Design an enzyme around this catalytic site. Structure first.
Site, PDB file in Angstrom:
ATOM      1  N   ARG A   1      -6.047   1.275  -2.817  1.00  0.00           N
ATOM      2  CA  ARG A   1      -6.769   1.007  -1.762  1.00  0.00           C
ATOM      3  C   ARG A   1      -6.092  -0.027  -0.634  1.00  0.00           C
ATOM      4  NH1 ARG A   1     -10.200  -3.368  -0.158  1.00  0.00           N
ATOM      5  NH2 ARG A   1     -11.558  -3.173   1.725  1.00  0.00           N
TER       6      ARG A   1
ATOM      7  N   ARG B   1     -18.392 -11.465  16.264  1.00  0.00           N
ATOM      8  CA  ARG B   1     -18.070 -12.732  15.717  1.00  0.00           C
ATOM      9  C   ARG B   1     -18.415 -13.766  16.787  1.00  0.00           C
ATOM     10  NH1 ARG B   1     -15.938 -11.789  10.902  1.00  0.00           N
ATOM     11  NH2 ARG B   1     -16.017 -13.829  10.448  1.00  0.00           N
TER      12      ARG B   1
ATOM     13  N   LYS C   1     -18.531   4.524   5.155  1.00  0.00           N
ATOM     14  CA  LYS C   1     -18.912   3.115   4.589  1.00  0.00           C
ATOM     15  C   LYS C   1     -20.310   2.869   5.148  1.00  0.00           C
ATOM     16  CE  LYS C   1     -16.047  -0.317   4.446  1.00  0.00           C
ATOM     17  NZ  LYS C   1     -14.783  -1.310   4.833  1.00  0.00           N
TER      18      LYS C   1
END
Lengths: 463, 463, 464, 464
Positions: free
Chosen positions: C32, C73, C220
């Site tokens: 990965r 964020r 994902k």
């Protein structure tokens, strides 16, 4: 072991107590009285004799009254002489009963013969010996084209496939004979020539009117009309008698095997008794051994799941009755020995099916059932348990009627005051019945805190 | 569509091409030649006629030679007159064949009759009409006590239950008739009176000696000795013929139904063909419709899983052959229609069982099989697929032999060079056979990279 | 051996050839590349090193690119000093990036923060450390009541549980990183923050426009929106990566185990691979033995039926990488050893690939040899969790690599497969040479005959 | 609702009546008394408080005494100063308790340390922080080579993996604590460090000699010896407590999940209760929300079939006790909701209690009413994980309490059960009054008729 029950038609050769006692030994369970023949004194004597034998031996048996039923027959011919009919010829039936017949026309017993029948319908005579097609209908005459050669005799039966015959459920002689059966306190009535649900009702209402409210009606399916309406005839009846040979006349041969199998399954599902009758061991009227073909037809009938097999003539007017009952009982045992359970929602369904499954997983030789009216015992038999069913009851008519159901040993008892009481008594009686022994497991099915007609409790005990 | 195959005994009424063509239409698959009767020219002509019809119509059929077989018979009586025997009397059989018989003694064809038999063994005469118990044996005489009354005729068959008869596997006429069948290139031999595994071997070695190495032997179980040794007779044979009536003589009636069922199961498990013969529709020799009892015995035989049903006399010397074949074919279809698969380790087992299961879960109407010797096609049939089996092969004898197996349509083809090739060709031929149509699924079973005798590959394709 | 595949995130501690060779020995199957960190030269170097090792040793492995993904964020505070927030206080988020924050408000990076979010929605900051409830929305301000005490830092992650976030499928960094993955010829892309079927398509079109049409997309699932749209996201994707830890923040804890189980079953049913990612053995970043809880979580994920387990940080920047891979491989073997097949206790491939496994087990065949062009056949056999190992022959190099990630598959590259019989004669030969079976063993040989790829219709049994 | 039972360790933070009442509301079923700490007055006070609350509110609960158990510990160091041990160094343990330790040796509390242990055995210190290998044994000295670097402190726990430790079944403190449990009439004793069947018997005889013959022994499996002897320990015990975290130290990590699963199945088969203990939600000592990993571990333990989950510290000395119980109850309900019965897909009780559940489900009966003297019938119905709730009528007060711990059982105390029909008429009446079923619902009524207790032989179906 055996379980399949034997119905024996009783007649002169076997009317004696000395014989009945031997019949029972050989495997007989139920006496059939075929009211097509015999007078009340003859039949009444047969009843009293069996009762006497039952009393002296302590053996239990049931009594089934088979009705003559309504019918269509041809009538007389010139000189009583058979006449020969040629395929293709015109031929006529007349409602005028005074008419003496010959090769062109004959009389019939049914005034509505010219009424129920339409052009193109088929007429069968002498259990299908001769077949005809209606070509015209003129007043009180019905004109036909014959379809095959054959000799017409006197007083021959007549069949009308796919035609609704409008005879009444009961001939007048049937009305009297049923009253006689209520008086004699028979356990079953086999009602001949059942065609509709209505017919069963007329008979049950007749029996209710003479104290036969508790007599189980077995509807005899003898033809196509009854086959078409089977589901509703079954619903109305307490049991079914399949007359393979008589039904053999009205429908295609290739289909008879599957009609018997269809009716058996649906009768078993309904927790109602079924009887395989006719064309059983007819060779044993003259011969002391059956045919292979005969022994295989019986065994296949049992494997199809029949409650009972029936002898007629072999036992009534036959030369070797005790041999027929014996080879029948030996075929019953041989075939029963190898059958398997069918452990396939009402409450009763769930409990009884589970009670058999539990009995088998514990190798219990006996399922003790408490029943007032019999539904509980018949609900266990539906699954074809290896275990024998020991049915405790306080009702004498019910003790009798359970003789006909497969693999059931009835036992009359004074009372059952509680469920725990039933268990105490059932164990006790399981032991003294010889069907189980100390240490064996037994499953005990009953209804607790519910009215009769419902089975909701299963219990396992060690003797 | 139907699947169950019809074997028809051919005789004078049906020896013509005009008739055979009609027989095939009506449902006939296999011609039986019963060599108990007829000379080589008669039989040879029947063969050539069927071959001619096959050629002209493009229909396929098989040819089965049924042997007379060895036998024990009584011999002549005074004046050729039947004599009456009384139960309890002494009675004697003599090996001296020159002796003319009467109510005290008679001759028999078998010199070893006084040898194979011991005191206490039972003797049956004329298919069990009369039974006797051996009480003494003096040189060339065998003395018996008769057990039931009955009339003894001339030239009557004799049975010795639970006794090993030491006749040879083959009478000399059988040795010649089998040579004739190798010359004629028959597809099956039905060997009568098979008692031991040894008997099958003697016959197969005989056939190997005359170019019949590829002829399938069907062992006829006719009696108790054969029943006792069935497992080893089955192992040695390519198929079984159950002669219910002849076996009916030697064992208890109550047991015959289950002997037929036992042999069927074990024959089906072995991927070998089984034939229900004798007492099929014998009423149709005289009558143009069968009995109900007859139609039910056939249907139950089919439900027991028979590959084929056989007509004898109904088709050979009967008055209504084409009707018998037709009602047979209609019973076959009616009964086949409702049967279910048996999707129950060798490799072939695993593949073929899976191939049927896959065919059913995808509703495939056809399982195409590639086979040289036939084992692959017969291995699929074992599970009673709903799908029809289309068996491609390059062998003519194998194309013929597969006519007898249940639910198999054989088709001769020039070659199969690869597995992918087989798929291309099988789809093509599935379509042109009318048994499947564009868009249908089909399962294609074969052996890849293995010798004949093994089936290891299953493939699914859309047409 | 084991059957379950191990994905290892490669980083500085483990990027050398000497290490990669050691990882593979220990049980690593797939590398990965975490593009949240590192530049193309570093990652390209890792790729080259594995390629070199593969050639030199002859071992086969796959390469998965995991995207950084989009984000929300917080930003800076006065003096860069942590501020203490008090439960019950009012607190405000602003879109204006120039704003320096304090105990009363802070800025956020996402201009659509004031849009995607509704009054009453819940806002989480710093992996759920602090939670807040929106009370009003005024222009570029989002006003909240704080729900628990906690210290807010600089540049902290933000989650909006059960909120339809209108970020793009791909950040602009993700687009240039995916182009890099096309250049490098990677075998998988793990696409972050998949929420809708549109996102998967946007990515599939991106890879097709740069020659990556043959790259498998692993989506994902990280939040409630993607969870709600799972069925359609699965259909569009080649596989799924379950980000359990990120889901723990976005949905109720009691639901995470069953979200993972729901998704595993649905991926297995679809013949697509699934990866257990996040919170595997994180304790092994500092320590050389995992906790009981960690090993049991992995084992239950394997019993749930995952194709592969993934190590992140444990292998990238950790102090005990080879030790984590080794105990990971030991959990995989111990757990795989005791799993049973699932024989569906209808289309052609199903009936065939499933009947082939049942056939293999009823004959105790140790090996199912599969002929596959694009890989669907091998994965269709894998669906049933065979005891047998799958030996997948193929002429496609990308497919040989990609099958490394599927459970219990040994890919083998081959020159050609000209006919079905040819396959049977190449497969027997090659079964023996693989050491996975020996003369006398039974083998089941699954293939597609006289059909296009994508259909597996033939099962064949042979003795070696 | 839920079905799985929650054991809560009660301590200072939660011993008040006001709290106990709140715990029960939140889902607490059983109070655990951890006798590793606290004196009889404190524990007796906790007992009295729950009893008071039970009487005042009418709720029913059970009381479990968990023993401190025997132990092996290190002792003091010079100046009480941590020492640093270096991998590879020689290091020594001494039985002489007067010895003060240093970086070369330390003393231990167990005089049989030099006996039970063989050369080559592995020694672990401070929950496996440091590992050592025995190289020789000289009198009262046990000499080792250290295997990893680590700092040794004072009075640290000791584990001897795969070693037959010859401690007694009961420490002398355990004997006086068990006597206390007889005085108090507790419902369960959780006996620590069960290794052999002899230990269980030693304890059963101890409780019988002080009037606790009716107290159920729950044996704590904590190490390899008890694991090896599990079958016989189960037979002698009334139930099992799995100390997973303590097993993580004594056996290989890869084996812990399957040790727990092996034991759960075997307890279910035996109709005895099992408890998931240790490492449940320890993060909730400091924090008000558990980690994903914690909630998933609990849920998998429930799916493994545990009767009860246990909280320790989370409920005793933690900052968020009511929050842990609540999320514990929420995991229990969420997970129980989706479990299915296990209808053994032969003796009388098996066939009957099992056939009764199958009957209940095929009729969609929400309640199985069981008549039980000692409890075996109710637990035999529970074996099959019925969807239906179990309503267990009994005349024994101790049994009514003990059934609180079994999964999906509502005990109901009753005056008498004179006959079977009487039971059917009391059970119908009481099914309705319990609110667990309503008129028209079906119920299955299991009992023992004309037999001694210990045999359940009758199943009966009724409509309310």
């Amino acid at each position: 072991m055996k379980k399949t029950k034997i119905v024996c038609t009783i007649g002169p050769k076997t009317e004696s107590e000395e014989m009945l006692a031997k019949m029972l030994d050989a495997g007989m369970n139920v006496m059939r009285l075929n009211f097509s023949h015999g007078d009340y004194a003859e039949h009444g004597q047969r009843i009293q004799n069996l009762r006497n034998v039952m009393s002296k031996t302590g053996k239990t048996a049931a009594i089934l009254l088979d009705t003559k039923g309504p019918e269509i027959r041809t009538m007389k011919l010139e000189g009583g002489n058979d006449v020969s009919l040629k395929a293709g010829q015109t031929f006529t039936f007349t409602t005028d009963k005074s008419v003496i017949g010959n090769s062109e026309m004959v009389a019939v017993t049914y005034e509505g013969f010219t009424t129920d029948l339409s052009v193109g319908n088929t007429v069968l005579v002498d259990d299908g010996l001769i077949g005809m097609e209606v070509t015209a209908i003129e007043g009180n005459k019905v004109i036909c084209k014959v379809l095959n050669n054959g000799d017409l005799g006197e007083n021959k039966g007549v069949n009308l496939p796919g035609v609704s015959i409008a005879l009444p459920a009961l001939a007048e002689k049937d009305k009297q004979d049923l009253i006689f059966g209520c008086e004699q306190g028979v356990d079953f009535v086999a009602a001949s020539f059942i065609r509709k649900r209505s017919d069963v009702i007329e008979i049950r209402e007749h029996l209710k009117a003479h104290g036969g409210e508790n007599i189980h009606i077995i509807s005899k399916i003898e033809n196509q009309e009854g086959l078409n309406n089977f589901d509703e005839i079954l619903e109305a009846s307490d049991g079914i008698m399949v007359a393979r040979g008589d039904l053999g006349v009205e429908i295609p041969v290739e289909e008879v095997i599957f009609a018997q199998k269809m009716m058996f399954e649906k009768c078993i599902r309904a927790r109602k008794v079924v009887i395989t009758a006719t064309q059983m061991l007819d060779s044993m009227i003259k011969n002391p051994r059956p045919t292979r073909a005969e022994a295989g037809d019986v065994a296949n009938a049992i494997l199809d799941g029949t409650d009972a097999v029936m002898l007629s003539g072999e036992s009534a007017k036959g030369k070797y009755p005790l041999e027929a009952v014996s080879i029948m009982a030996t075929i019953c045992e041989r075939t029963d020995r190898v059958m398997n359970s069918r452990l396939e929602l009402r409450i009763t369904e769930a409990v009884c099916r589970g009670a058999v499954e539990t009995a088998e997983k514990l190798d219990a030789p006996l399922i003790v059932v408490a029943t007032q009216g019999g539904k509980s015992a018949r609900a266990v038999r539906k699954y074809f348990p290896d275990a024998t069913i020991l049915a405790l009851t306080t009702n004498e008519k019910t003790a009798h009627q359970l003789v006909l159901s497969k693999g059931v040993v009835p036992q009359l008892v004074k009372e059952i005051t509680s469920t725990d009481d039933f268990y105490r008594l059932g164990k006790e009686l399981a032991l003294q019945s010889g069907l189980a022994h100390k240490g064996d497991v037994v499953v005990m099915v009953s209804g607790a805190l519910v009215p009769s007609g419902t089975t909701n409790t299963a219990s396992v005990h060690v003797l």
